[PDB]
Design a protein around this ligand. Structure first.
Ligand code: CLA
Ligand code: CLA
Ligand code: CLA
Ligand code: CLA
Ligand code: CLA
Ligand code: CLA
Ligand code: CLA
Ligand SMILES: CC1=C(/C=C/C(C)=C/C=C/C(C)=C/C=C/C=C(C)/C=C/C=C(C)/C=C/C2=C(C)C[C@@H](O)CC2(C)C)C(C)(C)C[C@H](O)C1
Ligand SMILES: CC1=C(/C=C/C(C)=C\C=C/C(C)=C/C=C/C=C(C)/C=C/C=C(C)/C=C/C2=C(C)C[C@@H](O)CC2(C)C)C(C)(C)C[C@H](O)C1
Ligand SMILES: CC1=C(/C=C/C(C)=C/C=C/C(C)=C/C=C/C=C(C)/C=C/C=C(C)/C=C/C2=C(C)CCCC2(C)C)C(C)(C)CCC1
Ligand SMILES: CC1=C(/C=C/C(C)=C/C=C/C(C)=C/C=C/C=C(C)/C=C/C=C(C)/C=C/C2=C(C)CCCC2(C)C)C(C)(C)CCC1
Ligand code: SF4
Ligand code: SF4
Lengths: 730, 32, 172, 183, 28, 80
């Protein structure tokens, strides 16, 4: 604790540049820090959590403040379909005059926003820059508060005990009823009091919200139980959003489908959704036994779920202790569920646009889908990484004897071998069918293509009421008890939306959609295979039966026993990242091309070209690259210059990653030795001495540095393309 | 914007002065 | 315990020997930073603000003949002499003085106080009495000048009005 | 019957809170049935109570004083002091903007240092040693405790009173003094 | 439109977050 | 430094000691195996962690095990 890093004496004693790198890379692995106790670990994490939350509120503050100060929110409200929202001003003294003009948006040099903040803020009732700014100040206070809380809870009297941190039943009650439930109840309050009034051109703010009742009938219906009153007189189908013209009085409805003007969910549906959700969460958070002698014990629930056959051995006996005592098990489950939520957000927000006019902001739609699927992809890789770490660091076989978790390890070869089978099957046949299609199309015979109708997915569209395919099942059947039950509620609005081919609600699907879905299945299964193999072999294999003794991350076990490069569970994380990027690539390529085709009104292009891979390269990548790569050229530059420059930058970063991934350490260490030699023997230069002996990056470090360049290049390349291709085209 | 001078002060600060100060501070911190 | 704020404990790193000590440090910046640096920073920010307050007071019934036809308002003046190329000569000259007075050790890491208490830069040509309560008189004038200067420039930005015109009979 | 050991004086059926021993100036009852002091810092809660007491007391007197008469240059259109209408006016005037600045200044440069000192256990919550006229006496005397107990009892009453003030004015749309005079 | 005063009020509150952030950072 | 451990299944074949390019290891008398000798790791301050010893060990699993630890001038194989 007398040289960086203070938390590792083993690193601090390292006389080489490795000390600095490993200091940075291990700074947050609190468990492995010198003299770390379980109590200090939890308390450090809790305080770090306050830091991270404060960061989220400062970032959000920044976005509100920049739009308030430098944006065109007020001008965008006036004309949301034509006006481009501004992110923030550019001040760059490297700009030539031509670049200042190219990026001039009105009277300001500025970036256009593709984050959808204007659409969201406008939908939730924000109407002017002073309201945004008030938001910014409000969130600076929230940041400051969390920084105070963070600071308080690492002061001796305010450090919570380990028993506090392992109070599962209490945290679940509060998080369900309070964090989810009451937040959703309070948010309902915002929609009913502020957002819905704002949608009907009625200003409700801090100035008047005490006096201005969000419904004419007040709270008399709510206490008399005459709740139908709140659903009467919804906004007409002629309602001009932000105005009273065709406005209703309803605050809670079940209209289904879209506001025809804003092509977004009804605010009164979203109000009533959140009321329903709030109640479900408040009830759900009264499940678990705290201090009042009612509710469930989570251990008692788990221990009871042992099938009497003995087919799951001891069932869930021991799982309670295993989960409660492992932060990595907890982080794994949390990342797994959050990943799924992030993917569901991506899928549901494009299909059922919540925000006024954002269906028309094509760049924002594409940006948001892509952003969230890459976050979801990172989260699920992380979930499995912490699954693997859990197995090495926290899993005790003796405490999990013959339970569901121990039984996974018992048949790991059955699991891995079957994931291998499904991956091989999907890979052979998906690549096979695409290559069949490419060859017969290349030979001028597209009628010889294997074009398998996605009839199961088409049948599901028909169950939700899509008439197009000729199936008359459930909601697409007039006589179904499913149809008749919903006819007076959401079904008219929903059927209108689902049978409209202009929106993204249950897009029409054909053979193109069949093939890419099997590509997506291949990617999910293979990424899963790598991560699961990583987790189930983390503790040991036939090649390294004592792997758990070497920990999550180590270079290898040397060239003996045939050679052991990339044997650590960390190496499975490293390999899975490539497959995650590849898979999210296929997903987001598919989303983007399907939407470009829809938005152009040339669905036929996607339908015909998507069934062979040259179609993707030519009609998606090559065709849509033109606006991007002409951001600058010999004749001049335009506002896409920054995406053109970023695009090349990202290709460079991607390719630089290959150096670290392909060329390994020994080459570099030998080269550095000659440079050290040269420096010491060069006059004048040799008066200057390094304090840290320069060495080549470590074996694992280069995998990480290579993967970061690869990942950054991968993401920035696609970001520049998906933005510039969409912005350039519309 | 209203305070259109501010980017002329803060972008150099965040972009040149503060990164040099931070690099200088971290250099001394990791070399002592 | 703190003389200025009895309800708060005394700032430990502060001492009564230091000039202008009231034990006033509610934020405890004397814990965060070396007192010798803060002390040096205080007197300097003072000495600079002192000259800044005089600058505004003199250039108002005068403005040196050879620079005549320049606005005496803070921001317009700054913009004029930067365009002129006078402020860049002053910047390098102040830069020169800073290196000369501190004798190379200019960094918070480097600056040292071997045989000099904070503020003692070895500038006493008239040879007036230093080691006494005269340091507290410099500090009080410096502290007042720092708030003074802040009051001038904010008055200059608010209603575009002269320092001496403000104290006649005006309200917004 | 009563509980076995030490019982809460204010509620003889409930057990006495662990931290509240009856010694505090305005805490003879040891009144904490919901058990806030069992989970929260007493020094924090005391600082908050005394802060609320002093803000509430000024605010209750402020309403009464502003009702009786307001200054001319402050063109107060609303006669209801705890109305949104009046609050909104003196935000736009910049009057509440000015007192916000010096309240925020106090809280950041005085109140927050003062709170942190109390959590460390080097300051009695609420103590700023402000007694120019010496209407309390020596710090820690029986006279000081009587005034300390008096501060809370007056403050707790003002805190509740301000609830009555706000809510009654919101229904009736009448002054607190106007309501007393007219039924 | 956001006034010079509003931008500077934001900056002092961001300064306060800076102070509180450094306080937390220094302790963690 | 690296940690080098010898487990009881060592058959005293000497192959790890012959393989070690840093002279970390030596053979010591021992009654536990027929060879009458066991590998020993007395000079692990000189161990570079090359695992030539493990490569040479014929037992299943290994009787000699190298746990890479805290890096030093010596362990990093630096001639500067
Ligand atoms: C912000 C207001 C506030 C705060 C922070 C405190 C804080 C405190 N009070 Mg005080 N008290 C208050 C208002 C407050 N009081 C008022 C208005 C009265 C008059 C009724 C009292 C009467 C009182 C007595 C007689 C005693 C205390 C005592 C205390 C101390 C111990 C109890 C506790 O932990 O806090 C309570 C923490 C809170 C956050 C307040 C509760 C707020 C929640 C949201 C509940 C809302 C209740 C609502 C008004 C309906 C009440 C009806 C029914 C449920 C009873 C603690 C310093 C004890 C002491 O030791 O004195 C020094 C003591 O003996 N208080
Ligand atoms: C009402 C009681 C309550 C509340 C409100 C919270 C709230 C919180 N606690 Mg918990 N906590 C509680 C009681 C409570 N706690 C109790 C009693 C215990 C002890 C038994 C704990 C023990 C505890 C620990 C040990 C930790 C927390 C942490 C947290 C924070 C989690 C991070 C976060 O901000 O999530 C925000 C969550 C939501 C907003 C919920 C919804 C999120 C899902 C994914 C919905 C999808 C989003 C939705 C559609 C909205 C979209 C918004 C917009 C962009 C359109 C959060 C502030 C962590 C922390 O960070 O502390 C600093 C932490 O480490 N708590
Ligand atoms: C999840 C719940 C939630 C969320 C995310 C929002 C979000 C928002 N609200 Mg809404 N609102 C809500 C619930 C919510 N509200 C509830 C329950 C009501 C009561 C029915 C309102 C009534 C309301 C009004 C009257 C107004 C808003 C406005 C806003 C916008 C700016 C808010 C701001 O500057 O505060 C910054 C954030 C904080 C201060 C966070 C910390 C929260 C503190 C600790 C709690 C105190 C709440 C509040 C700030 C002050 C209470 C006032 C008091 C008289 C009751 C923002 C979009 C304003 C707007 O401009 O609309 C477009 C506006 O005028 N809201
Ligand atoms: C809530 C989310 C969360 C939390 C609390 C943790 C916590 C932890 N993780 Mg986990 N993890 C997560 C999500 C999370 N992770 C996700 C989403 C993934 C998938 C990516 C992982 C994958 C993962 C692996 C593979 C490992 C961990 C490890 C750890 C431990 C800390 C390692 C460390 O010191 O980091 C320090 C981190 C760094 C020094 C990386 C710096 C930032 C990177 C390189 C991005 C650089 C971006 C670049 C600057 C942008 C360029 C811009 C361009 C324009 C130029 C810690 C327990 C490690 C561990 O030791 O556990 C045993 C470990 O090996 N995590
Ligand atoms: C285009 C690039 C590419 C391709 C085609 C593959 C293919 C494969 N990867 Mg690999 N992978 C890649 C890049 C690629 N990877 C990258 C960049 C990484 C990061 C290092 C990985 C890391 C990785 C890991 C960690 C894993 C995989 C696995 C797989 C297999 C997945 C299942 C499958 O699809 O089986 C079907 C097989 C194919 C599609 C391969 C091509 C088969 C060809 C078309 C047959 C050719 C026959 C024909 C007659 C021509 C003969 C030529 C002649 C000269 C003999 C598959 C062999 C996993 C696995 O092995 O699962 C079982 C696995 O765990 N990959
Ligand atoms: C926010 C980050 C930032 C900012 C504000 C700048 C700003 C500038 N850069 Mg850029 N630059 C940056 C990051 C940044 N750079 C990075 C990360 C790189 C690496 C890719 C570059 C690579 C780069 C190159 C290769 C060049 C620039 C140049 C410039 C200048 C062009 C405008 C001009 O015509 O001045 C013309 C010059 C002047 C008006 C003279 C002023 C020069 C400085 C400010 C002297 C100050 C002296 C002062 C007394 C002491 C302070 C010194 C220092 C501590 C600030 C401008 C000062 C050009 C330049 O002229 O630099 C000298 C140039 O050739 N930059
Ligand atoms: C240090 C000594 C000092 C002195 C003697 C003054 C004196 C004055 N100030 Mg200044 N002021 C000061 C420091 C000082 N200030 C500081 C540090 C700031 C913060 C930057 C201000 C910010 C300020 C503002 C915003 C205003 C004044 C105003 C005034 C005048 C008050 C007129 C009035 O409202 O009745 C008066 C001449 C007022 C004025 O000039 O009249 C319009 C006024 O509006 N002051
Ligand atoms: C807000 C504002 C106000 C501003 C008034 C505010 C409070 C006053 C602040 C100004 C301060 C006090 C100047 C500080 C005096 C500085 C002088 C210039 C010192 C001379 C040189 C000395 C003596 C030392 C050097 C030397 C030392 C080393 C010793 C020897 O070697 C000799 C020399 C070589 C001289 C109003 C009231 C005008 C109203 C307006 O409306 C708004
Ligand atoms: C809205 C807002 C405004 C004002 C905001 C703000 C000031 C409003 C303040 C409301 C407060 C003070 C209500 C307080 C509620 C009063 C409670 C309910 C009293 C306790 C209940 C009893 C019953 C318990 C006592 C007990 C009982 C059981 C009896 C005994 O036996 C024992 C004890 C233990 C004493 C404006 C004006 C700024 C405009 C802006 O536009 C928006
Ligand atoms: C007063 C005044 C002025 C000034 C002002 C200014 C200039 C300001 C500034 C400001 C600033 C300059 C600010 C700052 C800020 C900062 C912050 C707010 C930060 C944050 C942070 C956080 C939140 C976190 C972090 C972390 C990490 C990352 C690591 C460790 C841990 C932690 C978590 C801590 C003028 C001249 C106008 C004049 C008038 C008056
Ligand atoms: C390795 C490991 C780990 C990790 C893990 C993971 C990462 C996982 C994940 C996983 C996942 C990621 C999962 C998922 C799943 C999902 C599901 C299970 C779903 C289902 C669903 C359903 C059931 C549906 C239904 C429906 C439909 C379809 C329609 C209509 C409606 C309804 C609702 C009826 C842990 C940490 C644990 C620990 C250790 C080991
Ligand atoms: S790892 Fe290499 S240096 Fe170390 S004992 Fe084995 S052979 Fe010798
Ligand atoms: S190679 Fe293995 S079996 Fe042979 S002496 Fe060395 S440790 Fe023992």
């Amino acid at each position: 604790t007398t040289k960086f890093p203070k938390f590792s004496q083993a690193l601090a004693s390292d006389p080489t540049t490795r000390r600095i790198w490993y200091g940075i890379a291990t700074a947050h692995d609190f468990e492995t820090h010198d003299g770390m106790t379980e109590e200090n670990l939890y308390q450090k994490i809790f305080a770090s959590h306050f830091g991270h939350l404060a960061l989220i509120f400062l970032w959000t503050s920044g976005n509100l403040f920049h739009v308030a100060w430098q944006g065109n929110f007020e001008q965008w409200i006036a004309n949301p379909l034509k006006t481009k929202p501004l992110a923030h001003a550019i001040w760059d003294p490297h700009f030539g005059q031509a670049a200042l003009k190219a990026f001039t948006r009105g009277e300001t040099v500025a970036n256009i926003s593709y984050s959808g903040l204007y659409h969201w803020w406008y939908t939730i009732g924000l109407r002017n820059n002073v309201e945004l700014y008030s938001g910014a100040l409000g969130l600076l206070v929230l940041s400051a508060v969390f920084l105070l809380a963070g600071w308080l809870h690492i002061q001796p009297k305010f450090k919570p005990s380990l028993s506090w941190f392992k109070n599962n039943e209490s945290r679940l009650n509060h998080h369900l009823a309070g964090l989810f439930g009451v937040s959703s109840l309070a948010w309902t309050g915002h929609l009913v009091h502020v957002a819905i009034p704002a949608s009907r051109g009625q200003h409700v703010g801090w100035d008047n919200f005490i006096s201005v009742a969000p419904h004419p009938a007040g709270l008399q219906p709510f206490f008399t139980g005459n709740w139908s009153v709140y659903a009467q007189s919804p906004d007409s189908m002629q309602h001009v959003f932000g105005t009273n013209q065709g406005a209703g009085t309803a605050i809670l409805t079940f209209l289904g489908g879209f506001h025809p003007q804003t092509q977004s969910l009804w605010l009164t549906d979203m109000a009533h959704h959140h009321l329903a959700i709030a109640v479900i969460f408040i009830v759900a958070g009264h499940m678990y036994r705290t201090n009042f002698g009612i509710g469930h014990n989570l251990k008692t629930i788990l221990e009871a779920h042992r099938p009497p056959s003995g087919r799951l051995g001891k069932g869930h006996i021991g799982i309670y202790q295993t989960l409660t005592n492992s932060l990595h098990f907890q982080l794994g489950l949390a990342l797994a569920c959050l990943s799924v939520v992030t993917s569901l957000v991506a899928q549901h927000m494009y299909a059922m646009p919540p925000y006024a006019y954002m269906a028309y902001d094509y760049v924002t739609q594409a940006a948001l889908y892509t952003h969230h699927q890459y976050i979801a992809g990172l989260l699920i890789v992380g979930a499995f990484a912490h699954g693997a770490i859990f197995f090495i660091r926290d899993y005790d076989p003796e405490q999990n004897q013959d339970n569901v978790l121990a039984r996974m390890l018992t048949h790991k070869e059955a699991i891995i071998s079957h994931l291998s089978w499904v991956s091989l099957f999907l890979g052979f046949h998906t690549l096979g069918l695409y290559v069949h299609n490419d060859v017969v199309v290349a030979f001028g015979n597209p009628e010889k293509q294997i074009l398998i109708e996605p009839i199961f997915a088409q049948w599901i569209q028909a169950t939700s009421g899509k008439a197009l395919y000729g199936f008359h099942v459930l909601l697409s059947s007039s006589t179904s008890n499913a149809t008749t039950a919903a006819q007076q509620l959401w079904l008219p609005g929903w059927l209108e939306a689902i049978n409209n081919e202009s929106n993204s609600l249950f897009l029409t699907i054909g053979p193109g959609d069949f093939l890419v879905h099997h590509a997506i299945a291949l990617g999910l299964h293979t990424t899963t295979l790598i991560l699961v193999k990583g987790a189930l072999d983390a503790r040991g294999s036939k090649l390294m039966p004592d792997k758990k003794d070497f920990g999550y991350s180590f270079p290898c076990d040397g060239p003996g026993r045939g050679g052991t490069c990339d044997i650590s569970a960390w190496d499975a994380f490293y390999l899975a990242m490539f497959w995650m990027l590849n898979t999210i690539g296929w997903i987001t390529f598919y989303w983007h091309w399907k939407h470009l085709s829809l938005w152009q009104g040339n669905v036929a292009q996607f339908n015909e070209s998507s069934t062979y891979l040259m179609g993707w390269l030519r009609d998606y990548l090559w065709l849509n690259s033109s606006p991007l790569i002409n951001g600058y050229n010999p004749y001049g530059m335009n506002s896409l210059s920054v995406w053109a420059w970023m695009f090349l930058f990202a290709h460079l970063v991607w390719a630089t990653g290959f150096m670290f991934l392909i060329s390994w350490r020994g080459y570099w260490q030998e080269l550095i030795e000659t440079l050290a030699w040269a420096h010491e023997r060069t006059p004048l230069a040799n008066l200057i001495k390094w304090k840290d002996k320069p060495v080549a990056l470590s074996i694992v470090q280069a995998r990480l540095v290579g993967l970061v360049h690869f990942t950054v290049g991968y993401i920035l390349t696609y970001a520049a393309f998906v933005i510039a291709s969409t912005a350039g085209k519309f | 914007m209203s305070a259109s001078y501010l980017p002329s002060i803060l972008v150099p600060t965040v972009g040149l002065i503060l990164p040099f100060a931070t690099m200088a501070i971290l250099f001394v911190a990791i070399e002592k | 315990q703190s003389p200025a704020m009895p309800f708060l404990s005394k700032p430990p790193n502060l001492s009564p020997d230091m000039p202008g000590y009231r034990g006033f440090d509610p934020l405890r910046l004397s814990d965060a930073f070396d007192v010798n640096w803060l002390l040096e920073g205080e007197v300097k920010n003072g000495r600079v603000a002192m000259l800044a307050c005089l600058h505004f007071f003199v250039t108002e019934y005068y403005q040196f003949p050879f620079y005549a036809g320049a606005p005496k308002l803070a921001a317009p003046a700054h913009d004029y002499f930067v365009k002129s190329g006078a402020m860049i000569q002053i910047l390098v000259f102040i830069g020169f003085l800073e290196m000369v007075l501190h004798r190379g050790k200019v960094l918070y890491s480097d600056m040292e106080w071997k045989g000099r208490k904070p503020g003692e830069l070895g500038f006493n040509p008239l040879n007036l009495p230093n080691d006494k309560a005269m340091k507290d008189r410099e500090i009080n004038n410096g502290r007042l000048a720092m708030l003074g200067f802040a009051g001038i420039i904010h008055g200059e930005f608010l209603n575009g009005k002269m320092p001496i015109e403000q104290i006649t009979n005006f309200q917004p | 019957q009563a509980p076995s050991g030490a019982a809460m004086p204010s509620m003889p059926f409930l057990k006495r809170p662990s931290k509240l021993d009856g010694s505090l100036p305005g805490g003879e009852g040891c009144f904490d049935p919901l058990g806030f002091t069992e989970v929260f810092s007493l020094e924090w809660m005391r600082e908050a109570e005394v802060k609320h007491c002093r803000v509430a007391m000024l605010a209750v007197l402020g309403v009464i004083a502003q009702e009786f008469g307001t200054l001319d240059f402050y063109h107060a259109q609303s006669k209801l002091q705890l109305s949104p209408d009046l609050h909104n006016q003196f935000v736009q005037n910049g009057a509440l903007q000015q007192v916000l600045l010096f309240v925020c200044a106090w809280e950041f440069f005085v109140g927050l240092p003062a709170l942190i000192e109390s959590l460390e256990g080097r300051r009695e919550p609420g103590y700023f040693g402000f007694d120019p006229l010496k209407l309390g006496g020596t710090y820690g005397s029986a006279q000081w405790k009587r005034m300390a107990a008096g501060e809370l009892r007056n403050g707790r009453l003002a805190m509740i009173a301000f609830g009555g003030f706000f809510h009654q004015q919101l229904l009736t749309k009448q002054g607190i003094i106007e309501q007393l005079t007219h039924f | 439109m956001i006034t010079d005063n509003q931008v500077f009020v934001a900056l002092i509150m961001a300064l306060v977050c800076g102070y509180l952030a450094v306080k937390l950072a220094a302790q963690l | 430094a690296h940690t080098v451990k010898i487990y009881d299944n060592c058959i005293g074949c000497t192959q790890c000691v012959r393989a070690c390019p840093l002279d970390v290891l030596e053979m010591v008398p021992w009654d536990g195996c027929k060879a009458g000798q066991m590998a020993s790791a007395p000079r692990t301050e000189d161990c570079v962690g090359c695992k030539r010893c493990e490569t040479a060990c014929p037992t299943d699993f290994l009787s000699i095990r190298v746990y890479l630890g805290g890096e030093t001038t010596r362990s990093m194989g630096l001639a500067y």
